[PDB]
A paper describes a structure:
Here, the crystallization and structural characterization of [name], an industrially relevant [name] α-l-arabinofuranosidase cloned from [name], are reported. As in other [name] enzymes, the N- and C-termini of the sequence are found in the 12-stranded β-sandwich domain, but unlike bacterial [name] enzymes [name] has a 169-residue ten-stranded β-sandwich domain inserted following the 36-residue N-terminal strand.
Using this chemical biology approach, we aimed to determine the structure of a fungal [name] enzyme, identify its key catalytic residues and compare the catalytic sites and mechanisms of fungal and bacterial [name] enzymes. Clear density was present for the primary amine or sulfate group on C6 resulting from the ring-opening addition reaction. Crystal soaks with arabinose, 1,4-dideoxy-1,4-imino-l-arabinitol and two cyclophellitol-derived arabinose mimics reveal a conserved catalytic site and conformational itinerary between fungal and bacterial [name] α-l-arabino­furanosidases.
Numbering used by the authors: 1 to 627
Write the structure that this text describes.
């Protein structure tokens, strides 16, 4: 195909076109992006005196453990304590371990910060060392530190100890431990609460993020971060919905919540940590507010919304409010951030096409109130575009699609036929999730992708050329889900996978990165791809530099020749860079082969005419300079 490139831009490419969609799913938050290494660190939202309350916790030797509703809890928000008892006649090492989130990476190049709260519920003459550390799951101690404690300490007391491993572990099958001498400790009971183990964090943030994952997200050059969901916003009931104010302040004062993916959320990754991450990466938020529906099917009645609307106002005021004008904005100031954060976009609910009978009145009451308080914010509707008809008229819709790789290349013209009437579209969730048109959400045996493939990434890339061409009305687009803990998966495929030790960048990750890092501010119209065909392209240009980014998706099994004609330009560089992602159709980056498929960079000859053979199942970026 001959592709003629127009020198005259048709529109300015939004700064927000490519970004991330985050919720705590697959332990993407707890166990993932949030750097905390202990699972069930504070016994949040578990039933006392049950086995599930002790999840991730194990005795050392003859230790007696129970999670109790503490008669004098460490805080209002943390009613549960770990009751540790050493039997009469004990000796040696007695204590307990935390298995982490399916392991703990123990690296001698890291300093870890261990902390816990303890008290003796009954004053005693105990005198001895409390030792914390890291061991292999064989009991081989790799790091340890101790401090003197006394049975006369009946008031909650925090212990803060650094850990320095003497050796890196050969694998992640390691645990955190707390021990006392069994002879010195015989017959003693100690109550513990609010444990924590942190490695070094991204940007050395207090209560920050896991470095390799954070760096992987920053690597992709995202412009926005949509959060906190997704289904994880909604709750299963009104009472279990995400609430901003429960995620701010001291860890002692965050009660956690049962999330929407089968596990408890600590809310240690809370609103301020999200906003700090955005400051650290140059992302802007697309922030969702809860809109009167939860996943058990309950809509709030129109006459029940007012307190929930005010809570959404409170949440936005925490982000952007003048600290002199509201309690939430004053709280942001008090937590060390007097300056408002950026927030341009708020999403009203999540996937309210599941509650389209109530969304009209929910949308109406929420957006009337929020637009009056926040005249500069753009509010995004979550129902199917224009069905049902909403009032006020939404400025933006969030469009989600999970489909086959083929569907994505076949639907790259999805936005071309849309009216240009001031409405903008957010592709807030998309992914090629299955090769089975009949059972998209089924099993891997029935065609569900365990990981993105070259096929899925190239189909997505074709659809993304459509998003970029239509970026006069498409303002933002994010793959979902973003993150996967390979030991605790509720949804595949995912953009970035990891275990306790290392990260896997998917084929789809590299497509997302290639699109986002090679994006100018001018859209240059070109010869249209065949609507329904496997071969798609989109061309942008950086007005400041003349760097010109030709993105080519070949989502099919046939190599296809493209001849670019740039005769309209005064000058085209005599060379360009090629970046190409390609491989076998069903090839994946897996834990076993995490670098099977990676992009390759080369130099090609360019000018006003050049020819590129786009391989079967390839994503290609050619960068030239044009003036
Ligand atoms: C986060 O902030 C929300 C407010 O936006 C807090 O929710 C509010 O909590 C109060 C106190 O529990 C609720 O008032 C109570 O309602 C019950 C049931 O009708 C009543 O029996 C009590 O006498 C009292 O009036 C209020 O309804 C509730 N509001 C909403 C919108 O949920 C929430 O507690 C805060 N969370 C934390 C951890 O601080
Ligand atoms: C045990 O942990 C303590 C507490 O973190 C470590 O002592 C701290 O070390 C850092 C770095 O030198 C100092 O800046 C802190 O002021 C120290 N605090 C205290 C209370 O001493 C100590 O080095 C750790 N020991 C081992 C063997 O890992
Ligand atoms: C923008 O144009 C869209 C088409 O891209 C219009 O959508 C129609 O909206 C009415 C109700 O307002 C629906 O009953 C139709 O079914 C919609 N058409 C389609 C194809 O979905 C939309 O109303 C326009 N919006 C504005 C602000 O003018
Ligand atoms: C977490 O998941 C990883 C990756 O799937 C597991 O490690 C794999 O285990 C399988 C099945 O035993 C082996 O055949 C693979 O070779 C392992 N892969 C790698 C890269 O090591 C790991 O066992 C899981 N951890 C836990 C505690 O379940
Ligand atoms: N079904 C998806 C849509 C929903 O909002 C998310 O929580 C799910 C995984 O990305
Ligand atoms: Cl397919």
């Amino acid at each position: 195909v001959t592709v003629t490139v127009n020198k005259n831009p048709s529109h300015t490419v939004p700064s927000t076109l490519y970004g991330l969609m985050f919720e705590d799913i697959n332990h993407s938050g707890d166990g993932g992006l949030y750097a905390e290494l202990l699972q069930n660190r504070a016994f949040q939202q578990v039933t006392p005196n049950t086995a599930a309350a002790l999840a991730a916790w194990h005795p050392i030797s003859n230790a007696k453990l129970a999670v109790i509703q503490d008669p004098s809890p460490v805080s209002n928000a943390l009613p549960n304590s770990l009751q540790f008892s050493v039997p009469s006649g004990s000796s040696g090492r007695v204590g307990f371990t935390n298995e982490g989130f399916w392991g703990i990476k123990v690296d001698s190049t890291w300093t870890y910060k261990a902390s816990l709260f303890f008290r003796f519920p009954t004053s005693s003459s105990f005198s001895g060392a409390l030792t914390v550390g890291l061991q292999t799951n064989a009991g081989r101690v790799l790091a340890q530190n101790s401090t003197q404690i006394r049975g006369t300490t009946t008031k909650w007391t925090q212990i803060n100890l650094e850990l320095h491993p003497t050796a890196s572990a050969p694998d992640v099958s390691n645990s955190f431990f707390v021990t006392i001498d069994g002879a010195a400790g015989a017959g003693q009971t100690i109550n513990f609460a609010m444990f924590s183990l942190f490695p070094p964090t991204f940007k050395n943030r207090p209560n920050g993020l896991r470095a390799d994952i954070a760096e992987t997200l920053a690597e992709m050059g995202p412009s926005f971060f949509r959060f906190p969901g997704g289904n994880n916003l909604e709750g299963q009931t009104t009472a279990t919905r995400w609430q901003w104010n429960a995620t701010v302040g001291s860890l002692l004062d965050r009660p956690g919540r049962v999330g929407d993916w089968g596990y408890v959320n600590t809310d240690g990754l809370g609103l301020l940590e999200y906003l700090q991450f955005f400051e650290d990466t140059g992302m802007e938020p697309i922030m969702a507010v809860w809109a009167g529906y939860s996943l058990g099917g309950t809509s709030l009645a129109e006459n029940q919304l007012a307190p929930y609307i005010q809570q959404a106002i409170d949440q936005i005021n925490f982000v952007i409010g003048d600290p002199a004008k509201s309690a939430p904005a004053a709280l942001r100031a008090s937590l060390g951030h007097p300056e408002p954060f950026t927030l341009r976009f708020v999403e009203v609910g999540n996937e309210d096409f599941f509650a389209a009978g109530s969304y009209p009145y929910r949308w109406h009451d929420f957006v009337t109130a929020l637009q009056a308080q926040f005249p500069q914010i753009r509010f995004i509707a979550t129902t199917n575009a224009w069905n049902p008809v909403l009032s006020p008229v939404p400025q933006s819709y969030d469009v989600h699609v999970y489909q086959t790789p083929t569907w994505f290349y076949q639907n790259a013209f999805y936005y071309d036929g849309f009216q240009r009437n001031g409405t903008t579209y957010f592709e807030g969730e998309y992914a090629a999730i299955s090769t089975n048109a009949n059972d998209l959400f089924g099993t891997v045996a029935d065609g569900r992708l365990a990981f993105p493939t070259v096929q899925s990434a190239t189909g997505e890339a074709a659809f993304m050329t459509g998003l970029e061409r239509n970026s006069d009305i498409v303002f933002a687009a994010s793959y979902a889900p973003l993150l996967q803990h390979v030991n605790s998966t509720q949804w595949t495929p995912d953009l970035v996978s990891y275990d306790a030790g290392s990260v896997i960048k998917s084929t789809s990750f590299f497509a997302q990165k290639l699109f986002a890092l090679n994006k100018g501010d001018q859209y240059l119209p070109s010869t249209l791809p065949t609507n329904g065909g496997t071969l798609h392209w989109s061309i942008t240009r950086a007005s400041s530099s003349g760097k010109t980014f030709i993105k080519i998706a070949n989502a099919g099994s046939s190599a296809q020749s493209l001849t670019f004609q740039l005769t309209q330009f005064n000058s085209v560089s005599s060379t360009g860079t090629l970046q190409v992602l390609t491989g076998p159709e069903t090839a994946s980056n897996t834990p076993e082969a995490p670098q099977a498929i990676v992009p390759k960079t080369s130099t090609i000859g360019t000018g006003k005419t050049f020819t590129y053979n786009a391989p079967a199942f390839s994503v290609s970026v050619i960068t030239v300079t044009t003036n």
